Amino acid sequence: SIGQEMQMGDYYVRQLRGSAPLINDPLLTQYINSLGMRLVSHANSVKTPFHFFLINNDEINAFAFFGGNVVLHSALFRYSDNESQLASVMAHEISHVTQRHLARAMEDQTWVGALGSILLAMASPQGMISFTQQNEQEADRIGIQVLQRSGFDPQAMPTFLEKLLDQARYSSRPPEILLTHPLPESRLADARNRANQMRPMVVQSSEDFYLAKARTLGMYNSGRNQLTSDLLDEWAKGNVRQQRAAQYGRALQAMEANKYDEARKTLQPLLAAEPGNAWYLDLATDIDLGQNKANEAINRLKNARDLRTNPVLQLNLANAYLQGGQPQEAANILNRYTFNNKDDSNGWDLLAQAEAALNNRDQELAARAEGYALAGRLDQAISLLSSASSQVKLGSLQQARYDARIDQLRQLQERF
Amino acid sequence: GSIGQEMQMGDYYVRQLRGSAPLINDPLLTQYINSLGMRLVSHANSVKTPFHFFLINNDEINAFAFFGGNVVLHSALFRYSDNESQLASVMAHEISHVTQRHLARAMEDTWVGALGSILLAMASPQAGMISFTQQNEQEADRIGIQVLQRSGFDPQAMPTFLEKLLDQARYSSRPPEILLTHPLPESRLADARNRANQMRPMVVQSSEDFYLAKARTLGMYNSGRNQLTSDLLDEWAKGNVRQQRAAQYGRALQAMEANKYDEARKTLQPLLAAEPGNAWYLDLATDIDLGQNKANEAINRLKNARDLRTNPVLQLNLANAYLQGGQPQEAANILNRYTFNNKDDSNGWDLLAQAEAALNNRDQELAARAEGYALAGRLDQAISLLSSASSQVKLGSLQQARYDARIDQLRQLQERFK
Ligand SMILES: [Zn+2]
Ligand SMILES: [Zn+2]
Numbered sequence: 126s127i128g129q130e131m132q133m134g135d136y137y138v139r140q141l142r143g144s145a146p147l148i149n150d151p152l153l154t155q156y157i158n159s160l161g162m163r164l165v166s167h168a169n170s171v172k173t174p175f176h177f178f179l180i181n182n183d184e185i186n187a188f189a190f191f192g193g194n195v196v197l198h199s200a201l202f203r204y205s206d207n208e209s210q211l212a213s214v215m216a217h218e219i220s221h222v223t224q225r226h227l228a229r230a231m232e233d234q235t236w237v238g239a240l241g242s243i244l245l246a247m248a249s250p251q252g253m254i255s256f257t258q259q260n261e262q263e264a265d266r267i268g269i270q271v272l273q274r275s276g277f278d279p280q281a282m283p284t285f286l287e288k289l290l291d292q293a294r295y296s297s298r299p300p301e302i303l304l305t306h307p308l309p310e311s312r313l314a315d316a317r318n319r320a321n322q323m324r325p326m327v328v329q330s331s332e333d334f335y336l337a338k339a340r341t342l343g344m345y346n347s348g349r350n351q352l353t354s355d356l357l358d359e360w361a362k363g364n365v366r367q368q369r370a371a372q373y374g375r376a377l378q379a380m381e382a383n384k385y386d387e388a389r390k391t392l393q394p395l396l397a398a399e400p401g402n403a404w405y406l407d408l409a410t411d412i413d414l415g416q417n418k419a420n421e422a423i424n425r426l427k428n429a430r431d432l433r434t435n436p437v438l439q440l441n442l443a444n445a446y447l448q449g450g451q452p453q454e455a456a457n458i459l460n461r462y463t464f465n466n467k468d469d470s471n472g473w474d475l476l477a478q479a480e481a482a483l484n485n486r487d488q489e490l491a492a493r494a495e496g497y498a499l500a501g502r503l504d505q506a507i508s509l510l511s512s513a514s515s516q517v518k519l520g521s522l523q524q525a526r527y528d529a530r531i532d533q534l535r536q537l538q539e540r541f
Numbered sequence: 542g543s544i545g546q547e548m549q550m551g552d553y554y555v556r557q558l559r560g561s562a563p564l565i566n567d568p569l570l571t572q573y574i575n576s577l578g579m580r581l582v583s584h585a586n587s588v589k590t591p592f593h594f595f596l597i598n599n600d601e602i603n604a605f606a607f608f609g610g611n612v613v614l615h616s617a618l619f620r621y622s623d624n625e626s627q628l629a630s631v632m633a634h635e636i637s638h639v640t641q642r643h644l645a646r647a648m649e650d651t652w653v654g655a656l657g658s659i660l661l662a663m664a665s666p667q668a669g670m671i672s673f674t675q676q677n678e679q680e681a682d683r684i685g686i687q688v689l690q691r692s693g694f695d696p697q698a699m700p701t702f703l704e705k706l707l708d709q710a711r712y713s714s715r716p717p718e719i720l721l722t723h724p725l726p727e728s729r730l731a732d733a734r735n736r737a738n739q740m741r742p743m744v745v746q747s748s749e750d751f752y753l754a755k756a757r758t759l760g761m762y763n764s765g766r767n768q769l770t771s772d773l774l775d776e777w778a779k780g781n782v783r784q785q786r787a788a789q790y791g792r793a794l795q796a797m798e799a800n801k802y803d804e805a806r807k808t809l810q811p812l813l814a815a816e817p818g819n820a821w822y823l824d825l826a827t828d829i830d831l832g833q834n835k836a837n838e839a840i841n842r843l844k845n846a847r848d849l850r851t852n853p854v855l856q857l858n859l860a861n862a863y864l865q866g867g868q869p870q871e872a873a874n875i876l877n878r879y880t881f882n883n884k885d886d887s888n889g890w891d892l893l894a895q896a897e898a899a900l901n902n903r904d905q906e907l908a909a910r911a912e913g914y915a916l917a918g919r920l921d922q923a924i925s926l927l928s929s930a931s932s933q934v935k936l937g938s939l940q941q942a943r944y945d946a947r948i949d950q951l952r953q954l955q956e957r958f959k
Contacts, residue, residue, distance in 0.1 A: 451868070453867060484837050
């Protein structure tokens with residue numbers, strides 16, 4: 126049924142988090158899910174919630190499985206020249222889910238672990254899923270309709286397809302994206318026709334896209350996924366959005382190289398123009414904490430317009446409280462945060478740090494258990510909660526909470 | 542008014558003392574010395590003024606007093622005092638100098654500053670000097686021994702303490718400074734021994750606060766001859782069990798002074814387990830806790846204290862714990878009420894300045910540190926801080942009216958004396 130594949134989707138996500146190199150950056154996962162949910166917002170026959178994961182892998186690839194869980198390799202940011210092309214890849218994956226392509230592929234079939242090991246191998250940088258040409262024809266047709274309803278450029282799908290074919294037509298070994306997603310000339314030709322058949326729409330990539338590209342290529346450096354100064358030199362001559370993102374990108378690398386004084390005055394003009402922008406506020410806290418100016422980072426975030434609504438600002442201020450020697454205030458935010466974002470391991474780890482500083486050990490063990498549960502290590506999480514349940518009085522409310530959560534984790538184990 | 546003049550003349554000298562002499566401003570020690578002193582004053586005859594008792598970080602033994610019931614005791618008194626009744630006899634002796642107005646009556650025969658310069662030279666480790674007539678010293682011993690007795694102390698402690706001063710006046714090349722302000726001829730002694738012999742025999746035990754005060758004074762405020770010796774600590778390890786808890790307390794202090802915090806925490810544990818509610822070990826229990834950045838643990842323990850509403854030592858200890866814990870507002874809630882209930886306590890104002898600074902309430906920070914400067918006799922500097930405070934608030938506001946009013950008060954204190 127649908128309840129099992131949502132539950133089986135959680136299982137694959139948990140072991141993905143436990144061993145694949147997922148990017149857990151607040152701004153990046155917030156952007157990619159915001160953009161992804163915007164596309165789900167205009168998709169048909171959606172029977173599941175949707176979540177979008179970002180993987181630090183310089184090999185371009187994209188795939189999805191049960192429970193509406195979409196996996197995107199970080200290399201997609203360097204291949205996507207505009208926001209509509211990146212969305213073109215997501216709408217393709219989203220359609221793979223609503224059509225239940227992999228689901229029916231696994232209805233004709235130790236079987237869950239066999240696919241879990243395959244999904245894990247596709248995600249890690251170092252037996253692979255492939256879709257039939259019929260599935261891929263449907264995924265482009267329905268995908269381009271989701272993409273037009275979402276207010277992007279329908280022509281971005283064929284230009285992207287032609288971009289990758291023009292680069293991989295001759296290669297002995299094409300990129301992994303074309304093994305999971307076979308792109309013959311026939312599929313490209315049909316993609317270009319349906320794009321030609323609808324209306325022309327020239328859309329500007331959102332500001333958030335260009336800075337997501339800069340941060341992805343900037344902070345999550347690795348291998349071919351460096352942001353060469355070639356792209357930053359080019360963005361310095363581009364449109365008003367690409368020049369700001371260019372200077373944000375080098376303020377980012379200045380902070381990466383501990384050039385904190387250089388980073389502040391480099392980020393200087395952008396923060397003055399948009400003092401309530403999360404990307405600029407996030408980077409400003411990194412620079413302030415790197416120079417042991419925790420108070421200055423706290424006061425800026427406390428005056429932030431949407432601190433009370435934006436999860437990126439809450440995490441930044443909670444961490445600044447910690448570095449500022451105010452664990453209690455950090456815990457007050459993180460206790461609210463971890464219940465508003467139960468699956469966010471950043472919240473759970475920071476709460477564990479706050480509870481350690483406060484010497485509330487059973488609450489620290491409880492927070493540490495969530496990080497282990499989300500990473501698929503259920504036995505270890507059960508172990509921590511058993512310790513937490515042993516440090517509270519028998520018959521106490523807290524003991525009933527820990528014992529009840531152990532039951533949930535234990536029951537989650539017996540399903541697999 | 543003579544009593545009015547004497548009380549503000551005393552306040553002027555007390556403010557000069559705070560600003561230049563090395564006073565011990567520790568809550569536990571000042572509360573003990575004044576609790577012991579007030580217990581003597583409450584049994585003294587013809588007390589016409591309040592009394593305050595001050596402690597100097599000075600290894601030279603001396604004691605003296607002046608107008609307004611202000612008596613000054615050097616920390617060396619804990620080195621010479623074998624029992625609480627001996628220390629009480631010195632304070633009873635000095636209390637009687639005030640009630641008899643000896644220093645006041647001696648001065649009826651530039652002059653306000655001439656006496657103040659003498660007072661600080663005797664208190665400072667950098668030593669004119671006042672002296673009383675041996676008639677005056679007889680009245681102080683005669684009246685002091687009766688205050689000593691009505692207060693429940695050993696009257697034989699006074700001659701016993703006088704004789705220990707004489708055995709160092711010839712078995713040592715240095716006459717202890719106390720014997721020069723308070724001269725001790727054998728007649729003075731034989732008169733004292735006779736009176737004590739004619740009162741009731743009384744064997745009294747030193748309070749447990751005395752040994753802890755003696756340990757903290759010599760251990761934490763060690764200076765020169767004022768040491769907490771291993772010979773005395775091991776001697777206290779054999780005496781009554783009060784001295785053993787005090788001896789354990791002293792090594793916990795020195796283990797903390799040398800930043801051996803876990804060694805100190807583990808030494809202090811058995812005394813805290815027996816007496817979980819007394820301020821002495823509670824005070825250091827937080828001190829070691831914050832030495833390891835465990836401020837929450839110090840806070841939780843002090844919120845569970847019985848007498849937090851009544852004991853200033855507990856109130857400051859928790860306010861300081863809130864500050865190190867990163868909750869300055871909870872510290873300010875305590876300190877705003879604390880400073881109002883103890884306006885002459887500079888520890889309270891300094892902590893309020895810290896709390897208001899951490900809250901970025903700059904005008905209130907300046908006003909809090911203004912009180913510290915006013916208590917230290919730095920009235921020009923206090924006025925400067927309140928001038929800055931008044932310049933950061935709108936005119937016509939009450940903050941401005943209140944800051945400017947406080948400046949007016951400090952100016953009156955200023956013009957009363959040159
Ligand atoms: Zn596909
Ligand atoms: Zn005398």
